[PDB]
Each structure stands twice: as structure tokens, then as C-alpha cells.
Design a protein around this nucleic acid. Structure first.
Ligand SMILES: Nc1ncnc2c1ncn2[C@@H]1O[C@H](COP(=O)(O)OP(=O)(O)OP(=O)(O)O)[C@@H](O)[C@H]1O
Ligand SMILES: [Mg+2]
Ligand SMILES: [Zn+2]
Ligand SMILES: [Zn+2]
Lengths: 186, 926, 73, 186
RNA sequence: CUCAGCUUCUUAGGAGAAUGACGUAGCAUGCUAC
RNA sequence: GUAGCAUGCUACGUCAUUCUCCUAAGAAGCUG
């Protein structure tokens, strides 16, 4: 709590008292210098107490401001910070089904409705390109979410049913992508 | 043996297959209620004197008709002959046949009876009152031998439970008719033996399941025109079954039969005093005490509790749309308002406001408060509602569209989970695992939780027993100082809380506690002391972490009722909270050695202690109306010097109209509470403690009266039960000289520690094994037949050793540890709870550790005791919390330094990540 | 320790869904919330992973709100 | 206080102390006035303290008064607001049937539960599933509480209008139960 | 959106106690002067 | 005996902090 004009006087009084005790001055002079000390010290301590209270108030205000700022930051970017955490934990799990469906959704092969879990399952998927179609479908079987689904219906983007044999490498441009595939659990 | 059978069935053309072994008495083990000079109580007695004989019809089979052919001495035989000869005409009696047959060399009189069921009404009440699934074959036989339910229904999981399957109720109702028959035939018996000059005591164990009375050994002849049946021991042990089986269900039908249309009571009929009196004179004609249909005319709290126990049985007959506030058209400044100038309570009968101010002049703040609090104009201006999600009567819908409220999933603290998994937690095979999450619910959350009131059946309770249990329960509350206080003496913790509907539309409780000065509050409190103010109570949805996905709705009771209930009960409640060492430990901290003090208090010189405890399955909703009313009465026994009888009755009426059965607003629509305490009233915790003590005392009474009494080798206990029976079913007025004796007996052999539904008991184990004090089976039975819920082996427990301590109390486990050179009891919580609290939070800002460090300081304060747990991971939880607090402080310092070129000044915070700061929370010094 | 990680992932995913205003669709919100609740009180790992598959599929259906091509990484 | 007239006296003391101390002579007088300065300071401090206390109380009083004013204003607000509500909910009364039922009563006193059940001009059934819908609310008109209710509009849990033809056993899954049928009294 | 209980942290105010110090009044003793 | 100074003590005014109690306010945690 130095750097104040009172602390300099207090330190000079301390030095004077030290010199007096070194010289071993008389009890009257000793008392006089001891009281000069005590008054200078009594001033510096009061000033330093004022400084300390001012500093504690400033620190409390600063930490309250930091609380406000960080709370506002946390609330502002709450939507994207949750998605980032979600996908980080999804990668951490590194499950076969979750990874497979996320990769499919990367190419756009999203599911229209929730993926069922029972044998009597109704799964509808969108297949926006022939590359993903051939990658995911081979004949009358379908691979998705680490599960095998039997192709029941394959309807084009204009609601027209397509015969399975029609979809070929040379017939890909003819169809109006995306496709919609309805299948059951195998 | 052929001759004996022929003599028994000589007159009757029916066949007879001997159940006994050749004219030998059959072993009979039933529930004979008994009161001799050397024995008392209502217990299972091995009386082997009858010779059961069954009747065979064509296509030989055994119907439920037996000839109870017992033997009596010649004098008793002659007395039975004379008594029966004066009761032959009455049809509510068994057709006795008295015969004289020689057995070896002398004529032992072979008295006999005809067309008597195997079980009596005593067995029916005993099996439904003392019901343990370990041994409940009598209830099975009763429910299967009278077509109440098919036998295979007993293979269901939790068939007996009133919560797992409400269908059990439908089974019990099948008995009601039989009861309502034997509940009427008894009156005929009474009438007959009042006009035949016969005086005696009517006992359940002398009545078979079709109403016939088959025992006249305890009757003497007064002159004809006089005669008094004593039914206090009959109508009181049979009382709780009359609502369990809904005996008076054939009363809502014209001609009172089950094959005719329900009576169409005119909607405007609100006063049913005449019908109540007719029902009382029909079924309970000879009840010796004065029954007041309206309880506003009752004498004292023990009378408001007697005639209210009958209004819970007679009010199951009247239509459910006749109760609730009674509306009258007052005129203010000319405009006609509609206001509640009364209330037709399901228990307290019809209550009319003393000062109905029709043709008023002007409305000031208090007048507007009383008019806006009551649902008069809320349900008078509101679309008719038929919400079919709930099985609870729906009054009206205030808004034009229903409101659906969903429960959010609860944020996730990724930082703390990363820290914990980096410190070795959250692994496979670890004992400490996450089991507390913020569950989420669909839009039917609030209504689906409110629908749990369907467990709140209308329960009539044994009255001669409750009128004594209430005295003992007040003895437990005899050490407090309570009364009425002025508006300036009321202490309210949070004024920043909801005021309830409709007051939450304009402000918080602060705006209604400060706007109306003390004078208006005292005027409103003196208004409730002579008027009934109905109110609406929202059912708010609670967002809290739990290991179960229950919604946990809470009643946001209105301000107009909370203010007055506080002004009424505040002194008593504060006196309950501020006293240490009592049975009720509300207000006693668990820190600074408080837990050890409590544990040593519960052990206050119990001879052979080892604890048990319990948690009511669903206390708020399953609680009966009679027990809540009794709790509100014994908490008003402290006003003997400040409030008259009328004022205290009107306060009870206000409490019933505002808490017990008040129409709640569960999402913009007014419904009707079946009953039970609302978990938002000014006396919820203390009323729950009162109810818990009442259940414990009832268990003690049933365990001491259901003992045989011949095998009790403790003379003092034998006489204690012999006088307990007298004080219950023979004495009428409070017997303090014995109430205090039994209270001392309980507090000696049955210690308690009550905090709402949390109960810890340190019963004298050897007596409980003997049967002289309430075991846990007794408490289960009491809850089953009084509180109409079944308590399974998930709320109960029993610790045979004191050193370990209670298995759980307030969800805090107890452990004996060496701290301070003396063994002390430390409460450690569930580690999964602490980890869940750390990982999952309510607000998104709580997931940033630096902002909320005090959260973890408090959580470590609560989790410190685990440090002494033998399991290493349990202490690792606390050490992890300390390390994470240090990490949060380091991150905060770094963030402050980076964002601002100023270092964090002062380092008093080094205590929080050092264990010394948290051991000081369990040192008994402070 | 995947068993204790699927539950946290389910909490996070249901939070993300609730942010996408799937809560304004009572039927779909009921489906997803029941899936989340069943995930939490699951003593098995594979079953929790199937329910996680269903919940993540619920998230995937909302193609417009969530762009999983450039923010999956 | 800083501007308190007593300050002048204190100043004089200091002035004298700043003068005589500069001289550093006359001996006894220098020791005398020092005590007088202590006399000058003490009372002044005391007076200052008194003034400060008064100031504090004054501030408190003002705050209290201000607080009272706010409460009063808020009180009035709620009063007016509450009045409005009553008047509004007084006008929505179907005063014809309400007056009829009141007068038909024995003494002008009738239960509250029968007011909606006898004068309400609009029923509003919340149906949790389809079986209940066909059991109770079926058709374009029905009977509840002895009245001929005319189904006016059906909406689902999402507030999406539902045409009465959409509610079917086969089509029930694709609806958002419960359904809120706001019938009308015929 | 509730009713109570306990605990931790922070701020402001009041009182008391402990020790350090100044000033004044009084008492005991000591000293310079008459 | 008066004036002045010194040591000690009692009382009061003034402050310096530390501790205790509490009056209120804010933040949070746990329990029924
Ligand atoms: N948040 C609360 N607010 C008010 N009262 C509560 C609250 N929590 C509990 N209570 C009151 O305390 C009593 C019991 O609380 P508890 O937490 O044990 O619930 P519970 O109803 O016993 O449910 P269950 O036993 O099935 O878990 C309740 O009966 C209720 O009246
Ligand atoms: Mg409980
Ligand atoms: Zn009475
Ligand atoms: Zn009183």
C-alpha cells in the first residue's frame, strides 16, 4: 500500500525512530519520536485502508462486469455451441449406425421420418444421386443405420413409381432426382 | 357321528357333509373382537369351539353357508333360548336351532345356527385393516367366494396395490352391496332388540357376511320399550370399510338398487341436510352421539371431526356438481355481481358466510381481492369444459384454447464431464454412475401430473380411534407455543414469488403484501374468521433434477389464502421449527453436528433399539381428507385463548375451501381437486409431519390392540392395552390421565424423527417382535386401509445395527466416522446425485464454471462426508470437486488477466479447494 | 464408458432439437422426448444406441435448419 | 460538515498552529493552543458526525417515502386492473340464462359448478385419442349435460384446424392428439 | 410460478467485545519555579 | 499552595482494525 504521500512520511518516521534507538536516546526523546511515528503511521494506515476498500470495490465491480459479459456471450451463441458439442460427442461415440447415417446425411441422403426399430418397420429415405443410390442399394437390399431394409417402393421426385430394373447407369439422367425409398426391416 | 349330523340338520331338508372329524370341534382361527376383564383388543384369536357344517345342493358342491354348531353350558343355553325367543320375529338374525343331544352319558346342549357364512364381518374388517401380502388368504377367499373378482385376478403383479392398478377398487366395490346390506340389517337388529327390551353390545365378530347376528350370550333384558345397542365398537371398526367398498353406492339410484337409473337431483339443490339426516337415521340410526349434518353447528374440534367423518360417507351419494362455492347475486353500485356466499363442503356440510353483503355500496382493495380470488366469476364467465384427459370434474375453461406446457431437457456441463472422465470417473463397472438427469415431458405434463389425484379416494376413517390418536398427536405437539399473530408480526421469506391465480397476472406476492397495509391484512384475516373465501390454485410445473421422470407439479396457492393461513399458523410453525430435541425435527440443521445430535436424540434410552423408517409413496395426492382436516385442527388447538369456537371452525372451513378441495387452474382451465393436501399451502411441511405422526400413532394403537393379550407377560403393557381399548371404544371424552401415559409409553418404546413424509423410528425391537409396538407391517397396514395406498419394499427399511445408522433420511445416508477424537454421524449424499448436479444444470449460464463457482463450493460442502466413505470412488468424488474448483479458479484468473490487464486481487479463496473449509461444516462447535 | 456417454449425448441432442423449434410440433416433440427419456433410464448400451439413432434421425430430417455437410467436421 | 460554520473555528486553530509552530517560541503557549486545537478538532468532528447522521436519516426518509409512493401507485394500478377484469368477466355472463337459473333457485343461492353446466354457450371438449372422440364427441352435433351441442371447430394440439373428415380410425395416427373441439350450444 | 427448513458466498447498516492510538476531565505519585 | 512537565490509573469524545451478534438486500446450493 505504498506510493502514497503518507507512506513516505511514515517510512521517514520509522527511519528516525530506528536511528534514535540505535543512539539510545533518552526516554523523553524516545517518547516524542515514538509519537511522531504513531501519528505518521496512523495517517498512512488510514490512507491505505481507504485504498484497500476502494480496490476491493473496483475488483468486485470488474468481476461483476466480467460475469455479465460472459453470461451474455454464453446466451448469445447458445444454438451453434450446442450443435458443435452434439457433433463432437457423436464423433466421440464413433458408433457404426450413427456414423453411417451422418455420412449419408452429408451427401443429402437424409431420412424423411424417424428410423423405426421393430421388424414391422416403415423407413422412408431420400436418395438425391445415382452415386449414393448405387453405394447404398444393390439389388433389392438397402443399407442404412447399420441395418438392412428391403426395398418396397421407389418413387421419383414427381410421385411416379419406378420399376427396379429401370434404374441403371445409362438410365440415370432419365429419372427426376431425388428418389424416395420406402422399405421395411429385414 | 351320523346321529349328531341328523340332529343338526333334522329340521332342514338340506344335506350336511361333516367338516369336523366325527362330532369334533373344528379348528377356527378368526379375528374375534374381544373385550373381557382380563383381555381386550381386536386381534386374531384361536377360538376353537364351533363345529362348522356345510350344506350341499343338487350337483353336490359347497356353497358359502355353514352351520356353526357350538356348545354352551346349561345356564348360557337357557339364556340364549330366552334372548332368541324375544328376537325370533326380526329378520336380521340367524335362525337358531337349539337341541339337546347326549354325547356319552350327559346332555350337553348342542346349540346350532343356520345359513351362516364361513367368515364374519370381523374377518372382513380385519383382513382389510391388517393386510400384508405375505399372509392375506382370507381377503382372497372373501373376494373370490362372493364373485367380487375371479380367482385368476390374484396372479397379477401388484393386484392389491391402489397405484399399480386402480382396478382393485372396482373389485372392492363388489363387496359394498353386501356391506350395505349388513349395514342395514344391523339397524333392524338394533330396532328389534330395542323394542324387545334387550340391552347389549353389538360386535362385528357376531355378524356373518349376509347380515345375520348369531350370538346372544352377552345380552340382558331391560323392560320392553327400553333397550340400548352399543355400536361404538361395531360402527367404528367397520367405519373405514364403508368407503373402501363404497357401501353406500346403491344410494344414488331411485329405489336404492343397483338395477335402476341414478337419481336426477335438480342442479340447484345445494342443501342436502335432510338427505344427510335420512341417511344417518337409515344406516347409523343408533349412533349414540349427536350427528350434525352441517359442521358449523358442531361443538368442539372433536365434534367437527366426528360429524365430518360421516359427511365423507354421505357425500359420496350426492352429485359432484352440488359442492364447491355457492353463488349468489349481490349488487355493487347497481351492477349485479355473482359471489360465493357460502360453500358446500364434502365434509363440513353447508357453510354460509355470516355477513353476506348484498346490495353493497363500493369495493375497496380488500373487497376486490376477495371477489377476484374466488372462482365465482371465473367459472360463471367461462366456456363449459369436458377435459377428458383427467378423471376429475372439470368446471370451466377460461381461455378459448387449451394450454399445453412442455418440460425442457436441461443443459449439459461439458467441462465438468470432461474433467470427471479425465479423473477416472464415468467408467464401466464403477459403483458411482450417473442416475440423476433433467427429464423432459410432452405437452400433457401438467395435466398428466394433476391426474394423479385419482389416487385420492374419499376415505372415511375409524372415528373412535382417530379421536384418541388426535389427542396423542397433540401430545406430541404439546411442547410448542402457537396462536394468532397480527399482520406486523408475520415473517415471509420471499416476497418475489407468485401470488397464484388470478393475482399472478398483475404482480408478485410483494405487490399484494405491501399494497394493503397491516390494517387491511387484519381486516381480511378477521373476514376469514367469519366468512369462507374460496380460491383458485394453479398447478405449476417444477423443473428439477431427479432419478425418475415424474413431473412434480406444485400447487401455487393464491395470495388471499396464503396471507391468512400464515397469519393464523405462523407462530406455531416457527415454534415447531425453532425447538431442538423434539419429535418433529423441522428447522434442525444437518451441519455443525446437527445430524449427530438428531441421531443421538432418536436413541433417547430405547431398551433394544434398531431403527426403521419410511417415505410415503405419494403424500400430497394420496392423503385423505379426514387426516388433512385433523392436521389442520391439531395445528389450531393452540388458539384456545385467542379464537372462539366459531372463529376456529370458520378458519378450518377457509383452509378446506382454499387447500383441501379447491378448484385448481391446471393450464387455463378450472378443475376440481378430489382432496388431499396441496403442496403450496402455508402449513404443508408441518401438516405432513402431523399426518406422519398420526399414522405412526395409529400403527402403535393397531399393534397394541391387535395383540392377543394372553401372551403379553408385561403386566403394565397388558393393562395399557386393556385401558387403550376402553379409551377408544367405551370411553367418550378425552382421558388425559391415560393420553399422557400412552404418549409416554410411545416416546419410550417408540422414538421418532419426523420431517414431512420422512420418518425415522428407533422402536424397542424386542417389543415390536413381541407385538407391543408398531412394526413396519403395522405401518403398511395402516397406510393401506387409512391412506388407501400400498407401501412396498422401496420406501421402507430397517437397520438392525445403530452404528451404521439410518439407511436414509432426507436422501442423506448416515455413517459413523472418527472425527474430533469422538465417533460422529456424518450424512453423505448419493454420489450420483452430486455428479448429476455438477454435470447437468437448468440455465445455459450454469454450464460455464467460472461464472458459477459457488455452485461447486456448495456441492462440495454437501459432498464432503463421502471423503471418509470406505469406497475409494466415493471420496474421489469430493476430491474431484476440489480439483475442479481449483481449475475453475485458475481459468477465471487467466480469463481476467487476458481480457483485462489486472490481476485478481485478494486470495481468501484458497480455502475452497482445501478440505479444511468443509470439515468445519460438521464440527459441533458452531 | 459409452453407456454413460450416450445419455449425455441424448441430453445434448434433445436440447438441440428443442432449439430447432421441434417443440412446436406436439407429435414429433412427444416422439423425441419419449426417446430421450427412454435413453436416460436405459441400463443397456445397444438399446440406448438405437434410440440415439432415432433421435439423431429426428435431427437429420430438419435439413434446412441444420447443415451437416460443412459443420459435421 | 465541510461547509459547517464550526469548520471556521477549526481553521482558526490550524491557522494559529500553522503560525505559532512556525515561530516555535514562547514555550507554554505552544503547548496550550495545541490542546485547544484538540478541543477545536474534537467538537467539530462530533458536529460533523451528527450532521452526517442527520444526512443519512434524511436519505433513508426520502427513500422510504419514495418507496411508499411507488407501492401506493402500484396498489392503485392493480386496483384499476382488477376492476377491469371483473367488469370484463361480468359482461361475458349470459345474463339471460344466468338470471333465470338464479331466480329459479330456492333462495338465490346455487352451486358454482352448475353455472357453466347450465348457462355456458360454448362447450370445449379435449379428447386425448380417437376412441374417446367416437365414443363421446362423434358427429357434427352431440349431447353433453342435457344440451344439443353443435361442433363448431376442431383443432389439434398444434392449434392446426382439423376438418371433421380428417378424424378417422385409419387416419388417427397422423393427427396431433389431443383434439380441442369447441362445440356450441344450439 | 409454490410452502417451509438449513447451508455457503457477496454487499450495506447497527450494536457489542478485544487490542492499538490521540484529545479532554478527575485521582495517586514524581519533577522545575516561587 | 499556584503555574508548567512526566509516569500510572478511572471516565468520556475520536478513530484503526480483528472477532461476535444481528437488520436488511443480492447470488447460489441442498432437503420434504
Ligand atoms: N417442491 C415442493 N414444494 C412443496 N412441497 C413439496 C415439494 N416437494 C415435496 N413437497 C411436499 O412434500 C411432500 C413429499 O415430497 P417428496 O419429494 O417426497 O414427494 P413424494 O410426493 O413423496 O413423491 P414420491 O414419494 O413418489 O417420490 C410432498 O408430499 C409435498 O407435499
Ligand atoms: Mg416420499
Ligand atoms: Zn357435531
Ligand atoms: Zn387463534
Amino acid at each position: 500500500f505504498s506510493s502514497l504521500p503518507s507512506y513516505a512520511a511514515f517510512a521517514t518516521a520509522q527511519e528516525a525512530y530506528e536511528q534514535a534507538v540505535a543512539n539510545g536516546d533518552s526516554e523523553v526523546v524516545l517518547k516524542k519520536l515514538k509519537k511522531s511515528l504513531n501519528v505518521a503511521k496512523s495517517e498512512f494506515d488510514r490512507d491505505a485502508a481507504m485504498q484497500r476498500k476502494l480496490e476491493k470495490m473496483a475488483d468486485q465491480a470488474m468481476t461483476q462486469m466480467y460475469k455479465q459479459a460472459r453470461s451474455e456471450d454464453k446466451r448469445a451463441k447458445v444454438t451453434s455451441a450446442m450443435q458443435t458439442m452434439l457433433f463432437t460427442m457423436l464423433r466421440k461415440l464413433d458408433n457404426d449406425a450413427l456414423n453411417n447415417i451422418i455420412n449419408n446425411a452429408r451427401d443429402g441422403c437424409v431420412p424423411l421420418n424417424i428410423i423405426p426399430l421393430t421388424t414391422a418397420a416403415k423407413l422412408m429415405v431420400v436418395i438425391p444421386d445415382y452415386n449414393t443410390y448405387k453405394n447404398t442399394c444393390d439389388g433389392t437390399t438397402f443399407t442404412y443405420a447399420s441395418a438392412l431394409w428391403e426395398i418396397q417402393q421407389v418413387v421419383d421426385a414427381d410421385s411416379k413409381i419406378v420399376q427396379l430394373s429401370e434404374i441403371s447407369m445409362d438410365n440415370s439422367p432419365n429419372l427426376a432426382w431425388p428418389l424416395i425409398v420406402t422399405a421395411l426391416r429385414a | 357321528a351320523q346321529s349328531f349330523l341328523n340332529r343338526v340338520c333334522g329340521v332342514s331338508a338340506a344335506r350336511l357333509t361333516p367338516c369336523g372329524t366325527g362330532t369334533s370341534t373344528d379348528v377356527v382361527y378368526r379375528a374375534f373382537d374381544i373385550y373381557n376383564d382380563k383381555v381386550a383388543g381386536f386381534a386374531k384369536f384361536l377360538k376353537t369351539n364351533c363345529c362348522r357344517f356345510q350344506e350341499k345342493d343338487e350337483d353336490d358342491n359347497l356353497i358359502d353357508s355353514y352351520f356353526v354348531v357350538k356348545r354352551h353350558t346349561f345356564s348360557n343355553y337357557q339364556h340364549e333360548e330366552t334372548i332368541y325367543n324375544l328376537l325370533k320375529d326380526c329378520p336380521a338374525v340367524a335362525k337358531h336351532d337349539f337341541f339337546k343331544f347326549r354325547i356319552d352319558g350327559d346332555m350337553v346342549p348342542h346349540i346350532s345356527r343356520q345359513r351362516l357364512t364361513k367368515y364374519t364381518m370381523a374377518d372382513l374388517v380385519y383382513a382389510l385393516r391388517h393386510f400384508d401380502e405375505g399372509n392375506c388368504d382370507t381377503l382372497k377367499e372373501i373376494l373370490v367366494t362372493y364373485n367380487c373378482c375371479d380367482d385368476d385376478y390374484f396372479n397379477k403383479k401388484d393386484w392389491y396395490d391402489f397405484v399399480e392398478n386402480p382396478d382393485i377398487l372396482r373389485v372392492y366395490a363388489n363387496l359394498g352391496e353386501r356391506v350395505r346390506q349388513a349395514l342395514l340389517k344391523t339397524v333392524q337388529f338394533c330396532d328389534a332388540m330395542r323394542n324387545a327390551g334387550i340391552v347389549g353390545v353389538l360386535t362385528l365378530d357376531n355378524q356373518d357376511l349376509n347380515g345375520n347376528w348369531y350370538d346372544f350370550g352377552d345380552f340382558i333384558q331391560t323392560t320392553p320399550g327400553s333397550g340400548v345397542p352399543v355400536v361404538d365398537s361395531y360402527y367404528s371398526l367397520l367405519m373405514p370399510i364403508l368407503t373402501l367398498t363404497r357401501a353406500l353406492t346403491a344410494e344414488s339410484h331411485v329405489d336404492t338398487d343397483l338395477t335402476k337409473p341414478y337419481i336426477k337431483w335438480d342442479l340447484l339443490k345445494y342443501d342436502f341436510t335432510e338427505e344427510r339426516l335420512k341417511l344417518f337415521d337409515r344406516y347409523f340410526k343408533y349412533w349414540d352421539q349427536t350427528y350434525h349434518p352441517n359442521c358449523v353447528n358442531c361443538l368442539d374440534d372433536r365434534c367437527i371431526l366426528h360429524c365430518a367423518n360421516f359427511n365423507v360417507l354421505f357425500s359420496t351419494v350426492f352429485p359432484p356438481t352440488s359442492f364447491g362455492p355457492l353463488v349468489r347475486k349481490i349488487f355493487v353500485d347497481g351492477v349485479p355481481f355473482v359471489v360465493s356466499t357460502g360453500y358446500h363442503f364434502r365434509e363440513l356440510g353447508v357453510v354460509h358466510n355470516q355477513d353476506v353483503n348484498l346490495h353493497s355500496s363500493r369495493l375497496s382493495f380488500k373487497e376486490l381481492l376477495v371477489y377476484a380470488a374466488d372462482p365465482a366469476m371465473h367459472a360463471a364467465s367461462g366456456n363449459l369444459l369436458l377435459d377428458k384427459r383427467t378423471t376429475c370434474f372439470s368446471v370451466a375453461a377460461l381461455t378459448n384454447n387449451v394450454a399445453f406446457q412442455t418440460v425442457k431437457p436441461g443443459n449439459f456441463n461439458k467441462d465438468f464431464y470432461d474433467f470427471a472422465v479425465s479423473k477416472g470417473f464415468f467408467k464401466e463397472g464403477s459403483s458411482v454412475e450417473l442416475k440423476h438427469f433433467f427429464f423432459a415431458q410432452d405437452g400433457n405434463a401438467a395435466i398428466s401430473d394433476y391426474d394423479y389425484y385419482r389416487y385420492n379416494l374419499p376415505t372415511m376413517c375409524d372415528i373412535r380411534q382417530l379421536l384418541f390418536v388426535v389427542e396423542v398427536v397433540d401430545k406430541y405437539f404439546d411442547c410448542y407455543d402457537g396462536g394468532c399473530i397480527n399482520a406486523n408480526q408475520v415473517i415471509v421469506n420471499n416476497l418475489d414469488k407468485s401470488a397464484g391465480f388470478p393475482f399472478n397476472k398483475w404482480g408478485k406476492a410483494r405487490l399484494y403484501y405491501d399494497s394493503m397495509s397491516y390494517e387491511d391484512q387484519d381486516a381480511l384475516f378477521a373476514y376469514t374468521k367469519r366468512n369462507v373465501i374460496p380460491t383458485i390454485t394453479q398447478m405449476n410445473l417444477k423443473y428439477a433434477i431427479s432419478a425418475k421422470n415424474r413431473a412434480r407439479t406444485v400447487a401455487g396457492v393464491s395470495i388471499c389464502s396464503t396471507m391468512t393461513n400464515r397469519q393464523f399458523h405462523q407462530k406455531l410453525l416457527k415454534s415447531i421449527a425453532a425447538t431442538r430435541g423434539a419429535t418433529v425435527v423441522i428447522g434442525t440443521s444437518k451441519f455443525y453436528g446437527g445430524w449427530h445430535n438428531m441421531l443421538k436424540t432418536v436413541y433417547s434410552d430405547v431398551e433394544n433399539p434398531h431403527l426403521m423408517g419410511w417415505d410415503y409413496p405419494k403424500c400430497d395426492r394420496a392423503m385423505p381428507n379426514m387426516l388433512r382436516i385433523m392436521a389442520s385442527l391439531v395445528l389450531a388447538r393452540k388458539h384456545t385463548t385467542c379464537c372462539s369456537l366459531s372463529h376456529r371452525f370458520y378458519r378450518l372451513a377457509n383452509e378446506c375451501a382454499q387447500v383441501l378441495s379447491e378448484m385448481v387452474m391446471c393450464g387455463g382451465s378450472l378443475y376440481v381437486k378430489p382432496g388431499g393436501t396441496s403442496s403450496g399451502d402455508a402449513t404443508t411441511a408441518y401438516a405432513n409431519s402431523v399426518f406422519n405422526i398420526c399414522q405412526a400413532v395409529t400403527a402403535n394403537v393397531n399393534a397394541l390392540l391387535s395383540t392377543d393379550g394372553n401372551k403379553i407377560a408385561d403386566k403394565y403393557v397388558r393393562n395399557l392395552q386393556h385401558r387403550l381399548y376402553e379409551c377408544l371404544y367405551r370411553n367418550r371424552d378425552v382421558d388425559t390421565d391415560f393420553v399422557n401415559e400412552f404418549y409416554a409409553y410411545l416416546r419410550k418404546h417408540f422414538s421418532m424423527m419426523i420431517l414431512s413424509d420422512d420418518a425415522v423410528v428407533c422402536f424397542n425391537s424386542t417389543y415390536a417382535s413381541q407385538g407391543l409396538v408398531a412394526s413396519i407391517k403395522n405401518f403398511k397396514s395402516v397406510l393401506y386401509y387409512q391412506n388407501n395406498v400400498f407401501m412396498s419394499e422401496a420406501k421402507c427399511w430397517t437397520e438392525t445395527d445403530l452404528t451404521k445408522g439410518p439407511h436414509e433420511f432426507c436422501s442423506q445416508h448416515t455413517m459413523l466416522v472418527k472425527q474430533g477424537d469422538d465417533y460422529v454421524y456424518l450424512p453423505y449424499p448419493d454420489p450420483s446425485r452430486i455428479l448429476g448436479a455438477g454435470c447437468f444444470v437448468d440455465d445455459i449460464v450454469k454450464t460455464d464454471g467460472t461464472l458459477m463457482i459457488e455452485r461447486f463450493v456448495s456441492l462440495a460442502i454437501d459432498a464432503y462426508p463421502l471423503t471418509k466413505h470406505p469406497n475409494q470412488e466415493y471420496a474421489d468424488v469430493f476430491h474431484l470437486y476440489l480439483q475442479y474448483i481449483r481449475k475453475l479458479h485458475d481459468e477465471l484468473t487467466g480469463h481476467m488477466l487476458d481480457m483485462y490487464s489486472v490481476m485478481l486481487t485478494n486470495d481468501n479463496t484458497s480455502r475452497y479447494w482445501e478440505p479444511e473449509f468443509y470439515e468445519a461444516m460438521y464440527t459441533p462447535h458452531t | 464408458s459409452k453407456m454413460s456417454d450416450v445419455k449425455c449425448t441424448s441430453v445434448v441432442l434433445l436440447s438441440v432439437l428443442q432449439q430447432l423449434r421441434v417443440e412446436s410440433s406436439s407429435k414429433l416433440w412427444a416422439q423425441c422426448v419419449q426417446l430421450h427419456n427412454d435413453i436416460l433410464l436405459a441400463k443397456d448400451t445397444t438399446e440406448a444406441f438405437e434410440k440415439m439413432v432415432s433421435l439423431l434421425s429426428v435431427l437429420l430430417s430438419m435439413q434446412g435448419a441444420v447443415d451437416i455437410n460443412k459443420l459435421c467436421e
